[PDB]
Structure formats: structure tokens, C-alpha cells
Amino acid sequence: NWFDITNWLWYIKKKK
Amino acid sequence: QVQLVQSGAEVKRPGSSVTVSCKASGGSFSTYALSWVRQAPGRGLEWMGGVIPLLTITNYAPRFQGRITITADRSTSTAYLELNSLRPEDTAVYYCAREGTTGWGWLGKPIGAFAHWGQGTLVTVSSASTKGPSVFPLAPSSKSTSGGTAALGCLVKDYFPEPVTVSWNSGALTSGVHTFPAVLQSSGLYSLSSVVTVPSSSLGTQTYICNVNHKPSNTKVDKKVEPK
Amino acid sequence: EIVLTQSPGTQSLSPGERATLSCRASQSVGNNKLAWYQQRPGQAPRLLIYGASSRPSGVADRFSGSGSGTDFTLTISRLEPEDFAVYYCQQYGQSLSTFGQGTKVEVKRTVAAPSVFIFPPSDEQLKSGTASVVCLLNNFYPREAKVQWKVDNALQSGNSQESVTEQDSKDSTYSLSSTLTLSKADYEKHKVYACEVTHQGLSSPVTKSFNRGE
Secondary structure (H helix, E strand, O other): OHHHHHHHHHHHHHHO | OOEEEEOOOEEEOOOOOEEEEEEEEOOOOOOOOEEEEEEOOOOOEEEEEEEEHHHOEEEEOOOOOOOEEEEEEOOOOEEEEEEOOOOHHHOEEEEEEEEEEOOOOOOOOEEEEEEEEOOOEEEEEOOOOOEOOEEEEEOOOOOOOOOOEEEEEEEEEEEEOOOOEEEEHHHOEOOOEEEOOOEEOOOOOEEEEEEEEEEHHHOOOOOEEEEEEEHHHOEEEEEEEOOO | OOOEEOOOOEEEEOOOOOEEEEEEEOOOOHHHOEEEEEEOOOOOOEEEEEOOOEOOOOOOOOEEEEEEOOEEEEEEOOOOHHHOOEEEEEEOOOOOOEEOOOEEEEEOOOOEOOEEEEEOOOHHHHHOOEEEEEEEEEEEEOOOEEEEEEEOOEEOOOOEEEEEOOOOOOOOOEEEEEEEEEEHHHHOOOOEEEEEEEEOOOOOOEEEEEEOOO
């Protein structure tokens, strides 16, 4: 789901 | 605070392409999803598609796939919507919308749903040329003079494009005033009417004037409406 | 494509009453990604609920969302004056996002028959070669109303257009305006111009008319 991509990105720049 | 500001209204010829812009300020621009939603006059909201700037990843509704292009300029935090091969059915208000976030600030976890909306951009698809309206009186019936209520108004006809604003007695008269939505005639020109009801006994002691303003044609008429 | 059905499309309620609006999906909505928006005339939509039940900060807590799968509900515990508007549901459980057709919550009030007025064309317009006759149906409720134009008792078609106002914020009524347009030449070929009106508040059709040149 395209609408879930930004959530995933958020967790990325938040982890490392 | 996240704010979205869109470009101004536009009139486009059938078959042409239109580009609408949306400038964002506040919060992050590259990692949050921005969508475009349109609404035809008197109809519901329709999601057209969206884009995620950072990945330049677009997502278009099948209905528009092949006619739409959504882009984002990270250097100016501006998103764009391009819609081609325009038809009258494409006349609508186009809104840009950005997903909201959780907690305080505006750099929190994205929620997907559209929390932030632009002011909208009216795109009118038509072959018509700018034209100011003629303002005609809707004289109060002389068959109600003795007591009761009388109705009078103004017919603002044959103008293009929208909008037109109407007031009565320079804004001093609002009670009982009804200004109707314009209708689109076969000629491609609009027409609207504005009316007001008042005591029949005031027709001989009070003056009623409708102030019509159509900025595109610089038509600013103050028509005095009186018994015939 | 997930089709969202919002039925009924309109709900007539009184201020202070509770309201429950339904949104049914043609198929399960992934992860309950269902949102509700409110939209008032001439304004952009406003997000009320997301993820089916989450309420963003700033949104009045009298608004609540519930449901899952294909059955969702927006509840307004007590209707305030500003709550009378249109409500749209939206699913974003899959890449192709869709909106329901919306439900208008309007103010219920007592039935009011329309006050009908007919206006002959102005001398100013006639001088230009055109004749517009206007019929006004003022302050009625409910919204459903019908106007038929008759010229010398001949029912007209294709030469008129009408529009209706938003519900009045003060008396909760509606008004309708209809315009019949003909060329001056055609206008002068007929005598009687009439507007026949039908409404729930009228036991029988109301007709207003005039004789050209009288």
C-alpha cells in the first residue's frame, strides 16, 4: 500500500 | 504549522493541459505524502493521485492514469498537478492535501489521512471568453402593495467566468436576501439571480439597490430596483 | 476498487440530537485505514477521524469513529449548529484511495410551503432582444420542490434552468430560482406565462402567472 510508505521512511531516518 | 498555498483560478480551452501548483511551508516536505483531490460543482470529492517527493514515487487513480502527472520540487517545496486533454467534465475545484502526523509539532509519524488542505484552485474548462453581465431588475409585483410581503431582485445574466458577488444597499440589507448559485447556459455563459423580500409598505419609502461585482470584466453595477 | 457507500445520503436532524453516519465498503478495508471529513459550503474539507477511530488534536471530542472491516460509523454525540454540513468517508487501505459520496446532515424543521413569485422580463432586457422570465420559490422546507413552466398552457422543456440556495442558517429553509429564457420574437408570440409549483407543503399545485403586455 502506497499510503504506508512514508510511515516506513519515518522509522528509517528515526533508527539510523 | 503546515500550510499549503495553491495557484490561482484558471480558464482552459477544451483539449488543453492545466498545471496547478501547491507550495508548502512548515514541517517536512520530502518525506510526507501529498495528494490531489478534485470536486466538480455540486459533486463529491475524488482522489486523483499523490506523490512522495523523496522517492519521486507517484500513485495515480486508474481513472486518471495516462492523463495525469504529479511532480514535486524539493528546492521550493512545491508540488504540481498536470491534467491533459481537458474536457468540460474536468471543470472543478482542485485541492492539494498533505497527510497529517501524530503528537505535537508537524514532524511526527505520518497518518496517511489528509490533515492539511490547500485553499483549492478552480479550473474552468470552456471555449468562452471573458464577458461582463447585464444586470436587469426583478421589479416588485404591484399586486401586493397593500400590506403583506413583496419580493424583488436582480437578474445578473450572461457573464464569464465565475465568480460574481452581489450585495444589497452596499451591505446594509442582508435580512431576507437570497443570492442563488449561478447556472451555466447553453451559450457557455453564466447567469444568477439575487432576491430579497421586504414589507410591501416599504416600497414607497425605501430604496433597494443591488450591487453587482464581476472582477474579471470590471463590471461594477449598482442597480436601483423599483416598482414598475 | 473499493466502493464506499454512505446511506442515507442526507439526514435531517435537530440541534442537540445524536447522529450516526454509516460507511459500508464493498470489501474489507486494510488495517482499518478509514477516514472521515467534514465539509461546509465554500470551504475545504477538514479531517475529523483517521484510522477509523483516531481523532486528531483540535477536533471536538463529540465526534467519534468506530467499526472495522467493511462496517464503519461516525458518531456525533450532540449536534451543534456548526455540525450541520457534509461528511465524507475515505479508505486508504490500498494504493487506490476512494471516497464515499457523502452524507449531508441538515436541520430538520417544520414543513413550510414555498411563497411563489413570478417576474416578467424587464423593459431593459427586451430592448436587447431577449426575454427572461423568473420564478421564485421562497423559504420552503423540505428541500424537494418542482417547478414547471407553461406558456399558453404549453409545458416548456429545454428553455429553463434553476438553482437552490444552501439551507438558511437562521430559519433553516431553502429557496429556489428558475429562469425561462426566450428570444424577444418568440416571447411576443405568446400571451400567458405561468410557473406551476409542487411541494410537500402544498395540498395542490400553486400557479403564478401574468399576461404579456398587461
